[model samples]
Target: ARIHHHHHHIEGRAPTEQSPGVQDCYHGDGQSYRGSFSTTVTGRTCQSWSSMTPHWHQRTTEYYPNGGLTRNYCRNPDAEISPWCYTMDPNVRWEYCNLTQCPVTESSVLATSTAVSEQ
Candidate 1:
């Protein structure tokens, strides 16, 4: 659920209290996307890349207990450089899944304390 620029409310996650969940989101600063930007979790050994059009970018990695990722919204050759902007909202759609199973509805969540944070 990544967003770009400053539009209708966006959301993200940080190493805040309550054990900071993983399913996070982000926003960029401009609309002239230059496709060279990337993001990754801290100290992660894995590397994978993903994108969100002219808004944001993402990577596949692990989120350390006290670590996070940073991103730079690169601009087109003819565009001015803009500062990065982002936010955290509460309207993200969430899912719940397991290592060996698919996402399950709330009624099938099967009560578990270890299952915090939306999947």
Candidate 2:
């Protein structure tokens, strides 16, 4: 019982129903994301790659629409790992949006002392 006190679940992250503004957040496998996520990680709601009802996928939008996939935001135009779409919940077609992983920045060199690990 080595007593220690400092708890917050890494600070506030349990109330699941998140994401509503500030562009939702994404990076890395976000396929150079453009922000403004569209929802779907079981709560499905993304279906507008310029009209493709209940998933008739070909990653449309008049052929990518300048390759960023408009309107229904969450984008990762095939080669999936994050930012996914093509779902209007017609028995679920594609999913993986409710994203939040934009934490990778470093410029700390005040005489060099770095040791950050929050796992």
Candidate 3:
């Protein structure tokens, strides 16, 4: 799943985890809403650029395993970016995907195994 953000208390989500990314919920008035983060993750960060209201923000990592990433999937039927929300859609959500090959990472590992093993 593609990562997105949402409100603190919403349907189909768990408590105490960071905002996944964003989702669009229709109130059935021909209008939709883009939710916001209830809390920030402790180790990583992300940003949004395609929304009418751009939000390029960062957050700490939560419990992502070392060498992995928190990936959020897009769920629009046509896979289109909703103008109302900053995230892609409600497709699927994954806590960790390896980012070692990410072009932006200067090192093979950003966080050490010990760091993850600590708790």
In model 2, where is the ten-residue run with the lowest total lDDT? 16-25
Highest TM-score: give the candidate number.
2
- TM-score, candidate 2, is 0.29
Model 1 residue pairs with clashes: 11-88, 11-89, 12-88
Worst 10 residues of 1 by lDDT: 92-101
lDDT of each: 0.26, 0.65, 0.27
Give lDDT tens digits, candidate 2, residues 71-110.
6666777646677776766787777887656665765334
Residue 37 miss distance in model 3 (angstroms): 6.0
Runs of candidate 2 exceeding 4 Å displacement: 1-31, 34-39, 43-60, 70-84, 92-96, 105-119
Candidate 1 wrong stretches, greater than 4 Å: 1-16, 24-38, 43-119
**For residues 14-112, what per-residue lDDT tens digits would candidate 3 score against the true structure?**
664465543223222211212232111222222222222334333412233221223332111122222111243223111111111123325546566
- Sorted on lDDT, best first, the list reads 2, 3, 1
TM-score of each: 0.13, 0.29, 0.14
